[PDB]
Design a protein around this motif. Structure first.
Motif, PDB file in Angstrom:
ATOM      1  N   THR A 223       0.840  -1.188   0.000  1.00 36.98           N
ATOM      2  CA  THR A 223       0.000   0.000   0.000  1.00 36.98           C
ATOM      3  C   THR A 223       0.877   1.241   0.000  1.00 36.98           C
ATOM      4  N   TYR A 362      -8.005  -0.668   3.342  1.00 33.03           N
ATOM      5  CA  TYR A 362      -6.609  -0.855   2.960  1.00 33.03           C
ATOM      6  C   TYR A 362      -6.122  -2.279   3.196  1.00 33.03           C
ATOM      7  N   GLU A 363      -6.707  -2.999   4.152  1.00 30.96           N
ATOM      8  CA  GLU A 363      -6.212  -4.334   4.463  1.00 30.96           C
ATOM      9  C   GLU A 363      -6.581  -5.372   3.418  1.00 30.96           C
ATOM     10  N   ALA A 365      -5.667  -5.256   0.367  1.00 29.71           N
ATOM     11  CA  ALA A 365      -4.508  -5.426  -0.495  1.00 29.71           C
ATOM     12  C   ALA A 365      -3.613  -6.539   0.032  1.00 29.71           C
ATOM     13  N   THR A 379      -2.505  -4.149  -5.352  1.00 32.51           N
ATOM     14  CA  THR A 379      -1.697  -3.062  -4.823  1.00 32.51           C
ATOM     15  C   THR A 379      -2.525  -1.788  -4.833  1.00 32.51           C
ATOM     16  N   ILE A 380      -2.512  -1.063  -3.720  1.00 36.75           N
ATOM     17  CA  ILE A 380      -3.349   0.115  -3.533  1.00 36.75           C
ATOM     18  C   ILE A 380      -2.458   1.340  -3.412  1.00 36.75           C
ATOM     19  N   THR A 399      -4.353   7.412   7.747  1.00 41.03           N
ATOM     20  CA  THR A 399      -3.811   6.754   6.564  1.00 41.03           C
ATOM     21  C   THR A 399      -2.343   6.403   6.749  1.00 41.03           C
ATOM     22  N   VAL A 403      -0.388   2.531   6.033  1.00 34.98           N
ATOM     23  CA  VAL A 403       0.273   2.341   4.749  1.00 34.98           C
ATOM     24  C   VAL A 403       1.747   2.026   4.968  1.00 34.98           C
TER      25      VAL A 403
ATOM     26  N   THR D 195      -1.118  -4.514  11.581  1.00 32.20           N
ATOM     27  CA  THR D 195      -1.285  -4.736  10.155  1.00 32.20           C
ATOM     28  C   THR D 195      -0.578  -6.020   9.734  1.00 32.20           C
TER      29      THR D 195
END
Ligand SMILES: Nc1ncnc2c1ncn2[C@@H]1O[C@H](COP(=O)(O)OP(=O)(O)OP(=O)(O)O)[C@@H](O)[C@H]1O
Ligand SMILES: Nc1ncnc2c1ncn2[C@@H]1O[C@H](COP(=O)(O)OP(=O)(O)OP(=O)(O)O)[C@@H](O)[C@H]1O
Ligand SMILES: [Mg+2]
Lengths: 578, 127, 41, 317, 40, 470, 193
Positions: A223, A362-363, A365, A379-380, A399, A403, D195
């Protein structure tokens, strides 16, 4: 299907009675015109439905019908080369059947039900099928579209159609349970599609830009975030990513853009040519368009629709690049929706669950082993546009917390005609260490040390700017003017890259490695010569400066010979110099 | 180093898990074999009695039509009604007077809710 | 510059807190009005 | 062993639903919500009265309806099945394995909220822990039974320091003067709002040096339901307390990025429509954090200990 | 050396098989116990 | 036709009517009382038991015994025609110039449908506003949304009137072009006072600009719902003209701050919880529905251009109104209080100003090929001059180099001659000539951002070319 | 009840130079010691408990760490009373309610401590009352009022917070007891803004 009547109307909020049995968040059609809306609250025999479009002109007692399903997208052949809104409505066919305005309550299908497809079966009766397996293939431009059994379907094949021409509606496979499998299926946009296993970020996402690929790389399935300053050439970089990056399919999402900004992208893409095939780039992209005056719900669901389509194409085994433009506008739409629901704000008016939604987007990706056993990735690269460049905005803070990379685009570099205009001091990447073995195995075992040396030289140049500000550069002694000039050489010959040139628009990893090798060797020999007593002006007119400066514009296949010739010339020139 | 002892430990854990799931499969086979043997009427009547005792104000008793003749005796005793339903076997369910509460007493559910405590007990028996 | 920036940041938090309190009060009074109308008329 | 069903659902809005005739649901109980498709979800009774009981759904409420949904009581108090064989395992933060191995057999089931320690039962912490870092060990030494947080930032390497401390922590019994025999040591590692990249980093860090053989991991990803982030530190501390005060272990608990815990707590509080605090955080945040942090300590008459190292990032420094 | 890993793997397989056989020497009694508990 | 008499509640702007389920949501109704006076109202909520009506103006004479309510129209519609040119309206389409009502060709809902994004095309042609600092440095392109930011005491109304009076297209600069393409101006005023009303009326009537204009004028004491409805009616007329008769229309919205305040009041009157700083949560969406009605459509020859005008509440660009306006529009023009107090009109400050679509409407085949470079050079030179002007206050003129003195003189000449044009009307060529005359003050070779060809072609003219009659 | 309030005229010797010299407090007086975390409130109060010249010390641990109470319970029996020469714990009374104990009990603990202090004053002693933090008591009041759904004052506190604080702090003073003797209560309260 549960059917009822309107009881109360107050703006976008409608209360329907007789809706016992309706389920939460199911899409409903309100009134004789069939305006779509969601059920947001259930109470006794009544349901609170909130309509997307305007409710002006409705009357009490009009029918309300529940479709029984949440917000979903159709996944199948026919999405490529298409342009959609935030809830997957094909804008071109709406234009064809309606004109220049989007009338309320218009109904079109996301996938054309009329086009014929060349079905090619890949299963036989008596086989056992589980979700994610391939039933057959269909040609879609340059792609072989794989028809996948829905993830939740299991059974045994009863009968299969032969090869021929069929629409997306003919059942190609029938199971012993009586289930009919078609060329398409529906999936909720808010539930992630299943996979077998998530892999580590081992391989890089090669974008073709030297600065991004070397200094601030992003792994495939990673990301990244980028700011949106005006005049910084963001759109050029995005379309360069679309053209040159090694992704197979590109999904572009515009959620809250201005009308003319969307016009620019809708006009520019049909003219770009895909360098791999030589044909239009539009044959391998999907566009989602949303202006600011479109309904709020579509603007909020645009990114989920985009990521769902990207996940589907990943599940087909491809590599997908997803670009979400102006996620700040999506956050604004989310804030408005939360305000209409009467929720207590957190921080700058945003709902307290803004970070949760951003993380949920986002997760998705990542590089995975699909249920079919193949490998795919998403892919973001999401743009963030703070109100005035304030990095303390809640959206930006949330954000940057998730990322893995951040490419700080800068207007100052574009002012000085430096392209790409990426500030190498504010940017960072978290994928270098994990990607190092791939570099050692695929480009060179020395490459990481060379990259670190280039970064150290850049930092050293940055450290002297105080003295250069206070005193004119020429007053500094030879050894520091040397690092100033080698930093200038780096900036001009390695970081800069013209996207409009026929050969400089795309740069391979080995080309960048050769350029860095040449630059570092020249710097080492220059420092040695400076210690030998030569003046800096003597070095400043050596024959090799043109050779290094022109290494950018040589062809990819010609590059190794040019590189070894320049490496010879470097040693040759410094021996002539005393 | 520990890289070998970890393999021993994980193999032992896998073997123990396989043993316990085999025990579970044998247990479920034995439980589903119950309706074919004459032990069922007494246990199903006891389960129906337990369900009716769980609901002091229970209105009606619900089970599959095969068990209805045996539950007629309890229906005459407690005064509740009986009706047929293709419900889960090896148990009997009841409906409260208001119609908003309901109890269920299937034996597979009892196994599901008792295995968590029976696992540690049977683990000592196995080893 | 850092001192003035910190003062600005503090004033922003104060004003934000006052706004949040006002929103809470409005929510409570609207809830009371709705409850009165929907239960006692 | 039998189960009771409640079908008097009268109102669903956001994360809440009302059950009509459930007067025998106790306050704070854990329930199961079953819809028409057979999917089951968790919930907790946050308010019970004669008219109805209020249940907060552990996740999203899509697909629920007033005609087919039913509610069943799972257990009166939230509990966790603990065993000494949990060492060398990985869990998702709600207690379920994610390392691909069979579930453990519960030697005991313990409430996750715990009980306060009697101040008379405590004793003064008096022995140190060697973390292998000169600054901590010399100038700010950690002591068995202490809670010593780390105040990090937006780009500082908190994860690396956490992994290094987890790898290098030791007890040093030889320096104690008496030359006592070696004593068991364990590390309980809880990650909240993590994450995928950090998850892979932590997995490889624990697998590389064999430290995982003495560790228990509770790993909660950023895309998990927001309830699981609330319960992760409580399960970690339940495991730590069980080990320390039933097997005389010296356990070290590392809670990573408590800022995410605060965000989850704020989300839940705003969902329940409570009075906010200074920046939207719930007013009772002090008490909630205290109920977590004060489970560490040393008890008179027992040889085990619990030590905590919370890790958090100060917003805007 | 890889030989140590092979030796550990063989020992692990032997112990796992021994545990499996020991468990098979008790399975029916455990099943009877479980049915004794679950029944009313 | 049919009248409803079951009134059961009157308080403030709201009244409740029983057994009125036939009333559609949003309908317009007429309220009549005992003395026969009639008032207007809008339906804001409908239920099986009662309907809620928001009354226009005031409820002074109403009572629960004699008041009756009757339906006027299910959806608010406006009758449009080409006869509207040269007419004045009060904001709900009622004529106020004393002329007979028009006969509509069609009746259109005032709430407009969104434009299909695939039907839009790229704006590529400029509008000559007649003001140098706009035409040269912040060019307005046909189909752009370019707001003006003004202060409390600044003369934004005069600038609006001047732009409406002077604006025109220049077809003769685009290839051969076509001599006749219709041009029209739609002027909407919200919450103005009597003085501003008289000023606008006199300015439009005294120069013949009324013959090509449509006016929608809403006063400060008029009902707020009329203020809400006015811009939608103006944009409906603009869209009808542009996309049915191929006109090029320019729409001017006199004060968006008044619109935002009216929106806030209407929202508060309906018991809705406000968003940030007391403004409605859906304010961004409403402003987007207003602004995004401009543009150019593929296959159509007409166009719509919007110039919103709004006064910043406390000269704060962080305020919600300018902040949300910035996200939707392509740039801004900012007036300067310093220039106004110095006596310069119009007081447009080039440094904070910006036009985001300028690069498409200038060049060759439109305006002149030296436009962009000249504008960039002017911007840089003015910035240098204004910095040297502050430095000279401390260090003195004698300590400056020659170039610094020349920049200092350039800044003063720029302010006196380029910005301070007064009521004079300048073509694009005149503005470019003045810009080149001012650039001739600086020495050649310092013009770094201008190519040598244009320097050879145009540099060297003396200021007397405009100094003869500034 | 008392007979008569008296004007304080004798110092309350704390043993700390800065407080005893620059900012003295009399026997019947009240003092507040606000400060952020880590400033030194608890250490100062413990020093007052160890070294002051009061006959009886009442320590109210309202909403604080349990280790701080354990330290007192462990160390005090070994120390020496400054004036009578006996063990220090023989003159001390501890009311403890830690952070993870029930919230509503903090308000009860404050009043229990002050009432015990008043009783020992009534016996003719000079008593020093240490309140570990009144902010936790305020938080308990805020929570209880939130349950009652009352309309709150600034920062969510109930509007009657100041009245409660004034009523608590007014119990201090040097008095003539109902029995005709003389006693005093000194209150030092820590605040945690
Ligand atoms: N990679 C590049 N190589 C060469 N020229 C570039 C590159 N990127 C940008 N440029 C040039 O610089 C200009 C950047 O300014 P411009 O305002 O046009 O950017 P943009 O791509 O439209 O993005 P933004 O919306 O951030 O302004 C481009 O129009 C182009 O002329
Ligand atoms: N007078 C003192 N002499 C020496 N050290 C002191 C003194 N006062 C404070 N300290 C040091 O400061 C530390 C913190 O002080 P203390 O425990 O009193 O804090 P506090 O103000 O009560 O804070 P909190 O809000 O955390 O309860 C003590 O542990 C000690 O190390
Ligand atoms: Mg303290």
């Amino acid at each position: 299907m549960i059917q009822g009547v309107i009881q109360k109307i107050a703006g976008p909020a409608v209360i329907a009675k007789g809706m016992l049995g309706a389920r939460m968040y199911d899409i409903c059609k309100v009134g004789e015109e069939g305006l779509v809306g969601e059920i947001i609250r259930l109470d006794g025999d009544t349901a609170f439905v909130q309509v997307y479009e305007d409710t002006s002109g409705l009357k009490v007692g009009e029918p309300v019908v529940s479709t029984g399903l949440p917000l979903a997208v159709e996944l199948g052949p026919g999405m490529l080369n298409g342009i959609y809104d935030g809830i997957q409505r094909p804008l071109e066919r709406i234009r064809e059947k309606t004109g220049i305005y989007i009338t309320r309550g218009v109904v079109v299908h996301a996938l054309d039900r009329e086009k014929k497809w060349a079905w090619t079966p890949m299963v036989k009766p008596g086989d056992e099928v589980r979700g994610g397996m391939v039933l057959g293939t269909v040609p879609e431009f340059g792609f072989t579209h794989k028809i996948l059994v829905p993830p939740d379907v299991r059974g045994r094949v009863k009968e299969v159609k032969p090869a021929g021409e069929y629409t997306v509606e003919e059942p190609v496979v029938v199971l012993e349970d009586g289930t009919e499998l078609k060329m398409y299926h529906t999936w909720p946009v808010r539930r992630a599609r299943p996979v077998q296993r998530k892999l580590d970020p081992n391989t890089p996402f090669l974008t073709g830009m030297r600065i991004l690929d070397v200094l601030f790389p992003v792994a495939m399935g990673g990301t990244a975030a980028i700011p949106g300053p005006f005049g910084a050439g963001k759109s050029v970089t995005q379309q360069s990513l679309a053209k040159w990056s090694n992704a197979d399919v590109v999904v572009y999402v515009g959620c809250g853009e201005r009308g003319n900004e969307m016009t620019d992208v809708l006009v520019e893409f049909p003219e770009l040519t895909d360098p791999k095939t030589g044909g239009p780039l539009m044959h391998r992209t999907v566009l989602i368009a949303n202006t600011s005056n479109m309904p709020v719900a579509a603007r909020e669901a645009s990114i989920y629709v985009g990521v769902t389509i990207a996940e589907y194409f990943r599940d087909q085994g491809f590599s997908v690049a997803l670009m979400a433009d102006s996620t700040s506008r999506w956050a604004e739409a989310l804030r408005e929706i939360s305000s209409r629901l009467e929720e207590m704000p957190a921080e700058e008016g945003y709902p307290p669950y803004l970070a949760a939604r951003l993380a949920a987007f986002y997760e998705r990706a990542g590089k995975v082993i699909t249920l079919g056993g193949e490998e795919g990735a998403v892919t973001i690269v999401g743009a963030v546009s703070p109100p005035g460049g304030d990095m303390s905005e809640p959206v930006t803070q949330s954000t940057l917390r998730i990322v893995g990379a951040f490419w700080r685009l800068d207007a100052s570099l574009a002012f000085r005609r430096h392209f790409p205009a990426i500030n190498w001091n504010g940017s960072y990447s978290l994928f270098t260490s994990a990607l190092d073995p791939w570099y050692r195995e695929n480009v060179a075992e020395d490459y990481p040390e060379l990259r670190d040396a280039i970064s150290e030289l850049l930092q050293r140049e940055a450290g002297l700017q105080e003295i250069v500000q206070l005193v004119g550069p020429d007053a500094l002694q030879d050894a520091e003017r040397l690092v100033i000039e080698v930093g200038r050489i780096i900036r001009e010959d390695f970081l800069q890259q013209n996207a409009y040139h026929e050969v400089d628009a795309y740069c391979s990893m080995k080309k960048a490695y050769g350029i860095m090798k040449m630059i570092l060797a020249f710097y080492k020999e220059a420092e040695a010569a400076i210690k030998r007593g030569v003046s800096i002006d003597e070095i400043l007119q050596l024959p090799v400066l043109e050779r290094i400066g022109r290494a950018r514009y040589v062809s990819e296949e010609e590059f190794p010979a040019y590189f070894e010739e320049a490496m010879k010339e470097i040693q040759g020139a410094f021996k002539a110099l005393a | 180093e520990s890289a070998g002892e970890l393999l021993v430990a994980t193999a032992r854990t896998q073997a123990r898990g396989e043993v316990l799931e085999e025990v579970r499969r044998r247990v479920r086979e034995a439980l589903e074999a119950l309706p074919q043997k004459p032990e069922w009427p007494e246990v199903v009547r006891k389960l129906a009695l337990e369900a009716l005792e769980a609901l002091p104000g229970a209105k009606a008793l619900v089970a599959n039509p095969e068990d209805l003749p045996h539950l007629e005796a309890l229906a005459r005793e407690r005064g509740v009604e009986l009706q047929a339903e293709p419900a889960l076997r090896l148990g009997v369910r009841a409906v409260g007077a208001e119609g908003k509460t309901q109890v269920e007493n299937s034996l597979l559910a009892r196994l599901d809710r008792a295995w968590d405590a029976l696992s540690s007990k049977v683990a000592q028996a196995l080893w | 510059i850092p001192g003035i920036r910190a003062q600005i940041r503090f004033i922003q938090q104060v004003l934000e807190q006052r706004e949040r309190e006002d929103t809470f009060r409005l929510k409570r009074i609207k809830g009371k009005i709705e409850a009165r109308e929907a239960e006692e008329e | 062993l039998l189960k009771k069903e409640y079908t008097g659902i009268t109102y669903i809005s956001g994360p809440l639903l009302f059950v009509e005739n459930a007067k025998d649901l106790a306050y704070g109980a854990i329930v199961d919500i079953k819809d028409g498709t057979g999917r089951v979800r968790g919930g907790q009774v946050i308010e019970v009265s004669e008219e109805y009981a209020v249940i907060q759904v552990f996740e999203e409420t899509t697909g629920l309806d007033l005609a087919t949904t039913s509610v069943s009581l799972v257990e009166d108090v939230a509990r966790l099945g603990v065993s000494k064989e949990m060492l060398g395992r990985r869990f998702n933060g709600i207690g379920k394995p994610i390392d691909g191995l069979p579930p453990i057999t519960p030697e005991k089931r313990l409430p996750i909220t715990g009980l306060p320690l009697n101040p008379v039962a405590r004793r003064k912490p008096e022995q140190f822990i060697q973390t292998g870092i000169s600054t901590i060990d010399v100038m700010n030494t950690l002591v068995r039974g202490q809670k010593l947080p780390i105040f990090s930032g937006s780009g500082l390497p908190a994860n690396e320091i956490a992994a290094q401390i987890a790898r290098q922590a030791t007890v040093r019994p030889d320096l104690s003067g008496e030359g006592e025999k070696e004593e068991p040591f364990a590390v309980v590692f809880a990650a909240m709002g993590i994450t995928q990249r950090e998850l892979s980093y932590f997995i490889q860090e624990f697998e590389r040096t064999g430290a995982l053989s003495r560790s228990v991991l509770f790993l909660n990803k950023a895309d998990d339901p927001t309830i699981e982030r609330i319960l992760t530190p409580r399960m970690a501390l339940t495991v730590a307390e069980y080990l320390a005060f039933e097997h005389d272990y010296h356990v070290l608990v590392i809670l990573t990025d408590m800022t995410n815990y605060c965000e989850a707590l704020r989300e839940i509080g705003a969902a329940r429509e409570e009075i906010p605090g200074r920046r939207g955080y719930p007013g009772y945040m002090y008490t909630d954090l205290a109920t977590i942090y004060e489970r560490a300590g040393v008890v008179e008459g027992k040889k085990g200990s619990v030590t905590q190292i919370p890790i958090l990032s100060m917003p805007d420094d | 050396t890889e030989a140590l890993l092979a030796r550990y793997r063989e020992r692990a397989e032997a112990e796992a098989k021994a545990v499996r056989e020991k468990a098979m020497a008790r399975l029916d009694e455990a099943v009877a116990l479980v049915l004794k508990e679950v029944l009313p | 036709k049919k009248e409803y008499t079951g009134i059961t509640y009157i308080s403030g702007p709201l009244l409740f009517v029983e057994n009125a389920k036939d009333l559609a949501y949003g309908a317009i109704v007429d309220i009549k009382d005992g003395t026969g006076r009639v008032r207007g109202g809008q339906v804001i909520e409908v239920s099986e038991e009662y309907a809620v009506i928001q009354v226009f103006e005031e409820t002074t004479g109403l009572d629960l015994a004699t008041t009756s309510v009757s339906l006027v129209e299910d959806v608010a519609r406006l009758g449009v025609s080409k006869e509207m040119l040269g007419r004045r309206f009060n904001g709900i389409g009622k004529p106020i110039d004393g002329l007979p009502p028009i006969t509509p060709e069609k009746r259109l809902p005032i709430t407009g449908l969104p434009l299909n994004p695939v039907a839009r095309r790229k704006p590529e042609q400029f509008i000559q506003t007649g003001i140098s600092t706009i035409d040269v440095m912040n060019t307005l392109v046909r189909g752009q949304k370019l707001p003006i930011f003004s202060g409390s005491g600044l003369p934004a109304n005069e600038i609006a009137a001047q732009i409406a009076r002077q604006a025109t297209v220049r077809p003769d600069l685009s290839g051969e072009g076509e001599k006749e393409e219709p041009f029209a101006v739609v002027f909407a005023a919200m919450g103005i006072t009597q003085r501003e009303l008289s000023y606008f009326i006199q300015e439009f009537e005294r120069t013949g600009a009324l013959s090509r204009s449509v006016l929608f004028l809403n006063k400060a004491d008029d009902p707020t719902i009329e203020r809400i409805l006015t811009p939608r009616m103006a944009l409906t007329v603009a869209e009808y003209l542009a996309f049915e008769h191929d006109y090029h229309v320019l729409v001017i919205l006199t004060d968006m701050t008044n619109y935002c305040e009216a929106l806030r009041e209407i929202g508060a009157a309906r018991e809705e919880i406000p968003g940030r700083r007391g403004y409605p949560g859906y304010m961004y969406t409403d402003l987007a529905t207003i602004y995004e009605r401009a543009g150019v459509v593929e296959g159509k020859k007409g166009s719509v251009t919007q110039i919103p005008i709004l006064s910043m509440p406390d000269d704060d660009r962080t305020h919600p109104i300018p902040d949300l306006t910035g996200y939707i529009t392509e740039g801004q023009i900012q007036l300067s209080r310093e220039l106004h107090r110095k006596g310069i009109y119009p007081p447009i400050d080039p440094l904070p100003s910006l036009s985001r679509l300028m690069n498409n409407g200038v060049g060759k085949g439109k305006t002149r090929e030296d436009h962009k470079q000249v504008s960039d050079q002017l911007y840089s030179a003015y910035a240098n001059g204004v910095d040297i002007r502050k430095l000279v206050a401390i260090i003195g003129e004698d300590a400056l180099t020659e170039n610094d003195r020349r920049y200092l003189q350039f800044a003063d000449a720029f302010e006196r001659f380029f910005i301070n044009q007064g009521q004079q009307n300048r073509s694009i060529e005149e503005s470019l000539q003045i810009a080149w005359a001012l650039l001739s003050m600086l020495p050649q070779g310092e013009l770094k951002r201008i190519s040598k060809d244009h320097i050879g072609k145009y540099y060297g003219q003396k200021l007397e070319e405009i100094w003869g009659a500034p």
